[PDB]
Structure formats: structure tokens, C-alpha cells
Amino acid sequence: SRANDAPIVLLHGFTGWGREEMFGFKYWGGVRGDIEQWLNDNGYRTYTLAVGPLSSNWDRACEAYAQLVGGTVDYGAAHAAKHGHARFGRTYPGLLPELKRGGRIHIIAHSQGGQTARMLVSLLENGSQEEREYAKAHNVSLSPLFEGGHHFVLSVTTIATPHDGTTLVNMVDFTDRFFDLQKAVLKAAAVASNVPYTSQVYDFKLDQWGLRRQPGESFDQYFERLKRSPVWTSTDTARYDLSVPGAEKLNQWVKASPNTYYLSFATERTYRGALTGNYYPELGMNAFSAVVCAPFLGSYRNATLGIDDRWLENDGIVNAFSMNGPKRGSTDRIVPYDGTIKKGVWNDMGTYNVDHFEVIGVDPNPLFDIRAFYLRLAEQLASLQPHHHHHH
Numbered sequence: 001s002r003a004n005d006a007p008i009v010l011l012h013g014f015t016g017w018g019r020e021e022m023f024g025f026k027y028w029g030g031v032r033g034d035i036e037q038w039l040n041d042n043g044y045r046t047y048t049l050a051v052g053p054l055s056s057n058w059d060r061a062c063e064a065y066a067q068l069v070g071g072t073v074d075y076g077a078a079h080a081a082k083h084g085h086a087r088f089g090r091t092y093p094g095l096l097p098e099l100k101r102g103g104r105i106h107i108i109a110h111s112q113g114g115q116t117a118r119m120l121v122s123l124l125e126n127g128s129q130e131e132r133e134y135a136k137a138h139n140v141s142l143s144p145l146f147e148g149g150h151h152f153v154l155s156v157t158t159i160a161t162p163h164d165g166t167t168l169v170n171m172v173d174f175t176d177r178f179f180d181l182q183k184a185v186l187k188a189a190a191v192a193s194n195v196p197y198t199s200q201v202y203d204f205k206l207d208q209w210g211l212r213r214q215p216g217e218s219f220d221q222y223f224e225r226l227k228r229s230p231v232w233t234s235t236d237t238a239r240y241d242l243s244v245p246g247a248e249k250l251n252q253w254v255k256a257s258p259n260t261y262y263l264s265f266a267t268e269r270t271y272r273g274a275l276t277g278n279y280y281p282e283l284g285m286n287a288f289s290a291v292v293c294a295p296f297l298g299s300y301r302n303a304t305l306g307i308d309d310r311w312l313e314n315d316g317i318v319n320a321f322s323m324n325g326p327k328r329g330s331t332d333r334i335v336p337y338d339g340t341i342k343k344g345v346w347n348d349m350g351t352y353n354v355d356h357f358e359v360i361g362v363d364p365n366p367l368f369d370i371r372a373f374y375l376r377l378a379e380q381l382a383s384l385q386p387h388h389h390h391h392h
């Protein structure tokens, strides 16, 4: 039964856009519909975050905070100076001013969005010691996000998240395939990549870096410039955070709050080969992933980097082994779901036979009851108790 009234907030990964972008083709629902609308219609108040898809988890968290409470994005003086980007970004009206009033939220995140959510919670709770100290030594102002003490998040749900990174980033032609992936997503929403569209369409939100598609520039050309930009070349990027070392690093500081519930969902759309031990993509997997990404993910081994046979099963984009929760360089606890949702630990809700894009409806899958998946999820989050009790 309903035990809390917190609103649900949806969060995307290395790909994603606002509800008004892509001519309305939703990241959350894709060809299958509108996930946010489905939840709202069924009585679970739901909102959508849109943040920089290629940006670091840190930038994304700063953007999320501001998008939630309202205001101008504050990346932190120490952080901005450390990476040579702007300190202030876009201004948001704020989706949930109630947060400043004691309200809470459930975050449902997909792909890299899971890392962002974890980071958000950490910053909210603990702030940033480095930002606090930089503020004091330089006499610069400080965003509340870096103070700590905030309690807005009742839970975090991650779906197909690379908590321990994805081996996809080790592909020699990663840079080109990655951007071709973006092109495939554009293709899914019936948008061409060789057309200099005058409407926005897909805003990558690179205010901090001063980058944006110009008049007369198609996505193809825009991506060519991005590839040579700091959002692809720096350590303050999705590219880095998505990597096995980059993830481990993030895990070294981004910890599970003992005040928040965490749910994890894994995905797989592969089959094992008997003679090679490798994993192959199943019939139905989004075409781009099956041809370009899956073969690699299910065959790439690296002993020195710790990548072995447990890393081969994948969802076409991320290794399944990486989803149940942070493990590399982490102190977080992961617990297999036993009918009871524990606090401050990762509740491994299992593995689902869906690919990276089918799970959000971007790639069709008629055997996947997407509406029921999310409704079941919403009902489960709504049943979370704001404070459980110790019993026999």
C-alpha cells in the first residue's frame, strides 16, 4: 500500500533530452509511448530531468540540483578552475520548489543517469569538502549543493547503469562509434544527422564549455567538432566516467547514503557461445548495438584491468556485471532482493531480458510489457516507508 507521497523524477544517461526536444519523441518511452504520462495518469506524480548527455556526472548533478530547486547552475569554483570550464551555467525555474520545504523524491535513472543520481545524493548529503575549502581560501561564494545536509532523496533506482563502467569505451574506434550511436538514437526519433535543422532538436547543454550547434551545421558536422572538444577530450566528461577506471574513481567517493533506498535493475540481451565462452547478441536487439557494440562487449577481455568472463554478458551497450551496483573501488553493499527493500544498500532486483534501449522504449520489444514494468516499479517505490522499524 501507498506509504509515501514523493514524486518520481526520471533521469537519462549518455543520451537524453527534454520532453520538448526531438519533436516530442520521448527518451522515456520512445516508440512505446510516454512513460511520465503513464505514471501521472495512474496517480504517481512524475517529472523529467534533462541534463547534458555528454557531460561529467558532476556537471549533470549540478544541473539536476538547479533544475530541481530552481536557479542558476553552479558547477563550483574549485571544479570550474580545475577543468577550465565556466562556473555558472543555465538558469532553471525549478521543477520542485517543495524540496526546499522538506519534500522528498524518488529518482528513476537509466544508464549513466544512475551514476549521476548516486553523485547527486552524495553531494546533497555531504557536499564537497574541496569546494568548501576553496571557497574559504579564495573568498568565493558557495552553492548550497556543496554545504551538505540536504535530504531530498528517498530512493534511487538504476536501470542498466554502468556502476563499474562499460568496456565499450575500450573499443579502438570508440570515438566514432559512440557518436554513431547518437546518430542511431536520432534515427530512432526519425531525425536525420545530415540535415542542418534550424530548430534546436537535441540540445547537448554545453553551456559550461561554450559549445553549440551552429546555423547551417548538421549533427554529423556538429559531432565532428565535439569529438575534438573538451567534452570529449577532458577528464570532466561522460566518456571518462563511463570507463572502467573512470567509474572506479567515482565509486571511490560516491557512497550509498544510509538514509536512502537503492534499487538496481540489470539488463541482458545476449547468449553464450559454447566453444568460445563469448557472448553474442540475441535476436531483437537494436540493430546498431548488435552490429557495432555487442560483439565487442561480449568478447573483450583484459586481465590486467580485471575484465574477465563475468563481464561478457551485456545489454548491447553496458556489461551486465556492472549494473547491480558499484563494486570496483566501492564500499557500498549489494543485497539480493528478498521481498524486502532495505535502506542504505543496493537492492539487486535482478536481471531483465531487454536491451539498453528497449528498456526505455527507444527500441521496440513487443514481448516486453514496458507499461507494467514501470507501474510495478512506481507502486514499489510508493510503498517505501519513510522510516522502517526493527522487528523479529
Ligand SMILES: [Ca+2]
Pocket: 284, 285, 286, 358, 363, 364, 365
Ligand atoms: Ca528490439
